[PDB]
Amino acid sequence: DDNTEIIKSFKNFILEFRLDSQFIYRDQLRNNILVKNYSLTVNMEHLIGYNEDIYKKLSDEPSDIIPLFETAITQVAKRISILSLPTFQLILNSNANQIPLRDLDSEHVSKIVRLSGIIISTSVLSSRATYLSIMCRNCRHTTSITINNFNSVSLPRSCLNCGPDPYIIIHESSKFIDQQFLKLQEIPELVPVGEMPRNLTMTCDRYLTNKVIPGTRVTIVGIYSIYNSVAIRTPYIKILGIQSDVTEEEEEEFLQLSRNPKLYEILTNSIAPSIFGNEDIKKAIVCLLMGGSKKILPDGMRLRGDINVLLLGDPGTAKSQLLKFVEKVSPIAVYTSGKGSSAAGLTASVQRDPMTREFYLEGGAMVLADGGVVCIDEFDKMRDEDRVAIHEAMEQQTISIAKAGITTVLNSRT
């Protein structure tokens, strides 16, 4: 009754909205369907403008209302694409006031909130369930149960004699969807003095996976829900939209810039504008930033193309400032102090996974710097073993640690 009314309201919103002359969401859905992209992005501002009651219901109990929105989207997609498809996914964009990560509390349980932070770790894609086929052990009764990701399902305990938990899953006739776990850390600026950054686990499904990497500032719109792991619960966020800070016009601008007759001089000027003199070091750092073209031979002997530089002077010379600027300017860079870290910090180190207790390999600074630049400071204080490890790493650009239960190797082109 009420669910059908809400579905009809969403359908009418999608099919009737129009700003000046173009049906935004209808055309967007058609275009997305054409390229096998089953999703729809809706700006909450338009939803509020069209009818405030729909947004009121959506914000009140999102876990209950959002699935109906997906059902309506799927029905409209079938109407628009098939002449008389999996359940579509809803992605939300919003411009509401951001709630600081540290300020999230019980007051915001099961509500749509907008926050920001920096991603620090991402997991590997899992396989959640969306349509399970179940058969009973004793009487062999076939049945199917549908599942939605949002929580405000488990195998039946009573058969539809047969004892408790009589059903088993027929995996050859079921459907699954992708899932991923991310970790969000509060922005460094907002951390109060003398305190520590707090982390928050997050979950994304279907077309929101593989959208970010560690170290990227992101803005998240999702549901602040709690999952049971005295009577406490572990908070986490269910992602509904990702907007990371990370065409042809920029190509034209860059081409015009390249046409300047003093491009080399301007680029050498931009390198450390605040440090006087040391022009030769400036040019060398520019060359290092751009690097050298790769060389590969069919036989197997591929020559190195990257460039390394050594600055060896007395104190008070701004070498560290140059290294900091190089780290900041390069799209991918790692600034590491030789003495602060160790052999584990650089190259790679063989460790053990605590949860599964299996020997695995974790990369160092060079591995995290693959495809970029690593600015190592205080080369002297670094231990000799680490220095020879770096020697090998730069010699082959492929840290060869493949032993001790595993035989995996990693690339360190840096």
Partner 1 sequence: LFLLRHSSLYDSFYYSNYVNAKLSLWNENGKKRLHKMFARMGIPLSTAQETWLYMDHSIKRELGIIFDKNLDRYGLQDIIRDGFVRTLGYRGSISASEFVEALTALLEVGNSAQKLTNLRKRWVSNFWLSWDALDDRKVELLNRGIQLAQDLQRAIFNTGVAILEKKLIKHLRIYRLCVLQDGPDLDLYRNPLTLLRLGNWLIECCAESEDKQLLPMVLASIDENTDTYLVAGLTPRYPRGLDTIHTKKPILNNFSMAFQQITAETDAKVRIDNFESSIIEIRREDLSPFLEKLTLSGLL
Partner 2 sequence: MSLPAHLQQTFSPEEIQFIVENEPIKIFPRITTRQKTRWQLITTDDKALNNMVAMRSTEVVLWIALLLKQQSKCSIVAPQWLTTKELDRKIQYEKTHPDRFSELPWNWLVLARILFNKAKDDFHDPIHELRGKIQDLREIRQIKVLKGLKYLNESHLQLDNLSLLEINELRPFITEIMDKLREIHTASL
Partner 3 sequence: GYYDIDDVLADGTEFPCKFQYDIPGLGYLENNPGRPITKNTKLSLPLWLARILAIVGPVPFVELLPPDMFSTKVMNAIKTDPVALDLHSINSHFFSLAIKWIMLFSEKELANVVSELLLQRAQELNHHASSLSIDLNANIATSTFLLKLEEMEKEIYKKSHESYKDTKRWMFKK
Ligand X SMILES: Nc1ncnc2c1ncn2[C@@H]1O[C@H](COP(=O)(O)OP(=O)(O)OP(=O)(O)O)[C@@H](O)[C@H]1O
The residues binding partner 2 (CB under 8 A) are 15-16, 18, 21, 23, 26, 30, 80-84
Contact between 14 and 29 under an 8 Å Cβ cutoff? The reply is yes
Does the annotation flag 320 for ligand binding?
Answer: yes
Interface contacts to partner 1, rule CB under 8 A:
17-20, 44-46, 48-50, 52, 56, 94-97
In the structure encoding, which two tokens stand for residue 130, read together? 């969306």
Phi/psi at 115 (5° precision)? -140, 180
d(CA 31, CA 27): 6
First to last CA, the chain: 62
Residue of 285, 366, 365, 380 lying closest to 325 (CA atoms): 285
Using the rule CB under 5 A, is 136 a contact of Zn ion? yes
Classify residue 303 as exposed, middle or buried by CB count within 10 Å of its CB (0-12, 13-18, 19+). exposed
Q: With CB cut-offs between 5 and 8 Å by kind, which of Zn ion, ligand X, partner 1, none does residue 95 bind?
A: partner 1
By CB under 8 A, how many residues form the interface with partner 3? Answer: 17
Angle at CA 381, nearest 5°, toward 379 and 382?
Answer: 65
Query: What DSSP line would sit under 14-35, residue for residue?
Result: HHH--SSSS-HHHHHHHHHHHT
Choose from partner 1, partner 3, ligand X, none: what does 94 bind? Cβ within 5-8 Å by kind.
partner 1
Please check if 319 is assigned to a binding site: yes
Q: Could you say which of 159, 187, 329, 409 contacts Zn ion (CB under 5 A)?
A: 159
45 binds, among partner 1, Mg ion, Zn ion, none (CB under 5 to 8 A by kind): partner 1
Q: Cα 173 to chain center, whole Å?
A: 31
Confirm whether residue 315 is marked as ligand binding: yes
169 binds, among partner 2, Zn ion, partner 1, none (CB under 5 to 8 A by kind): none
**Continuous H helices in 39-153:** 44-50, 52-60, 62-81
Residue 275 partner contact from partner 3, Mg ion, ligand X, none using kind-dependent CB cut-offs of 5 to 8 Å:
ligand X
- In the complex, the smallest distance separating the C-beta of residue 89 from partner 2, rounded to whole angstroms, is 22
Q: Please, which residue, 36 or 140, has the CB nearer to partner 3?
A: 36
Distance CA 271, CA 288 (A): 11
Q: Is 363 helix (H, G, I), strand (E, B) or coil?
A: strand
Q: Tell whether residue 337 is a contact of Mg ion (CB under 5 A).
A: no
Q: Return the one option of partner 1, partner 3, Mg ion, none that residue 47 interacts with (CB less than 5 to 8 A, by type).
A: none
> What are the C-alpha distances in Å from 85 to residues 12, 20, 82, 148?
21, 31, 10, 16
Rg (CA), the chain: 28
Contacted by 116, from Mg ion, partner 1, ligand X, none: CB < 5 to 8 Å by type: none
Looking at the DSSP bridge assignments, the partners of residue 235 are 226
d(CA 220, CA 228): 23
Q: How far is the CB of 63 from ligand X (least distance, A)?
A: 54
Residue 317 binding Mg ion, by CB under 5 A: no
What count of other Cβ atoms lies within 10 Å of the Cβ of residue 163? 10
- Selection from partner 1, partner 2, Mg ion, none that 56 binds (CB < 5 to 8 A by kind) is partner 1
Nearer to ligand X, 359 or 379 (CB): 379
CB of 5 to partner 2, least distance (A): 21
The reply to whether 139 sits near Zn ion by the rule CB under 5 A is yes
Whole-angstrom Cα distance, residue 365 to residue 327?
13
What track of x and - describes contact with partner 3 for positions 43 through 72 (by CB under 8 A)?
x--x--------------------------
Name, in order, each residue with C-beta under 8 angstroms of 252's C-beta and a sequence gap of 6 or more.
none
Q: 291: which 2 tokens?
A: 């690097």
For position 231 contacting partner 3 by CB under 8 A, the verdict is no
**Between 23 and 207, CB nearer to partner 2:** 23
Q: Which two tokens stand for residue 66?
A: 């959002």
Identified binder of Mg ion from the candidate list 12, 28, 110, 320, rule CB under 5 A: 320
> Given the complex with partner 1, which of 52 and 165 has the nearer CB atom?
52
Residue number with CB closer to ligand X (277 or 298): 277
Q: Which tokens in the block code for residue 389?
A: 């490890």
- Cβ 181 to partner 3, closest distance in Å? 22
**Binding positions for partner 3, rule: CB under 8 A:** 20-22, 24-25, 27-28, 31-32, 34-37, 41, 43, 46, 93
**Binding positions for Zn ion, rule: CB under 5 A:** 136, 139, 159, 162
